[PDB]
Design a protein around this ligand. Structure first.
Ligand code: NA
Length: 260
């Protein structure tokens, strides 16, 4: 069994569901931004989903990242951005401004405030539906209250369920993406390139996902997935100690899973 820095860890055969690795797999902790995995999931599960639907970037999205000094995708107020582009902004650079734009768009209500509450309601429903018992969301980005928790097992199950969507898989394995946005004056703008925060996509052969995460209480987290020889391993590492250690914990666990 590999020794990892993270205090919570889990991994399974994505195809069979057979547990491969365990370390406090059912102890709840803070998720931080790994929470965006569920935002993506809920969005992609909407009946009224249209990847080509444009969204105007509101001043609110911008002020939000500032008020919370959160990670962002550098969305420009006034710009029209497609739902598909927002999914790359959410998952690659971990854009909290993009997460907000998505919650506001797919929540149900007459005000932005009403719609984000309804959206977070959806996130929690999608969890219950997965038959989860240790997961609870209080935000759409993971930057909201201590009532935002999960466990290495629940989160892995949430990721495995999202990896079932082809658009999700396409996004999560992309190393770089350059959004071409429509401007206030109707012109095309070339945004600065978004690079994926997940280093495994470049350091670990076969790596296909899924999403990094961090926070004041969540520390450094990583939900990984790699496929080798037709066998795909998927897992989660919660509360590792550094960006490098998070990727290391994951690498050690995956190497262990593939050789079992
Ligand atoms: Na991160």
């Amino acid at each position: 069994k590999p020794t990892i820095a993270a205090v919570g860890g889990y991994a399974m055969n994505n195809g069979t569901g057979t547990t491969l690795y365990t370390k406090a797999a059912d102890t709840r902790r803070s998720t931080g931004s790994t929470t965006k995995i569920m935002t993506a999931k809920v969005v992609l599960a909407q009946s009224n989903l249209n990847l080509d639907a444009k969204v105007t970037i509101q001043k609110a999205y911008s002020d939000y990242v500032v008020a919370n000094n959160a990670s962002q995708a550098h969305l420009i107020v006034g710009d029209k951005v497609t739902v598909r582009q927002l999914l790359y902004g959410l998952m690659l650079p971990s854009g909290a401004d993009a997460a907000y734009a998505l919650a506001d768009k797919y929540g149900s209500g007459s005000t932005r405030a009403a719609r984000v509450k309804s959206f977070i309601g959806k996130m929690n429903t999608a969890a219950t539906n997965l038959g989860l018992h240790n997961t609870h969301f209080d935000s759409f980005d993971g930057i909201g209250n201590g009532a935002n928790y999960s466990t290495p097992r629940d989160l892995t199950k949430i990721a495995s369920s999202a990896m079932k969507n082809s658009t999700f898989r396409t996004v999560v394995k992309t190393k770089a993406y350059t959004a071409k946005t429509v401007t206030k004056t109707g012109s095309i703008r070339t945004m600065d390139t978004w690079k994926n925060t997940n280093g495994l996509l470049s350091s670990y052969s076969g790596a296909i996902g899924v999403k990094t995460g961090s926070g004041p209480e969540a520390k450094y987290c990583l939900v990984f997935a790699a496929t080798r020889g037709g066998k795909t391993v998927i897992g989660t590492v919660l509360a590792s100690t550094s960006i490098p250690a998070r990727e290391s914990d994951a690498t050690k666990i995956m190497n262990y899973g593939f050789a079992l």
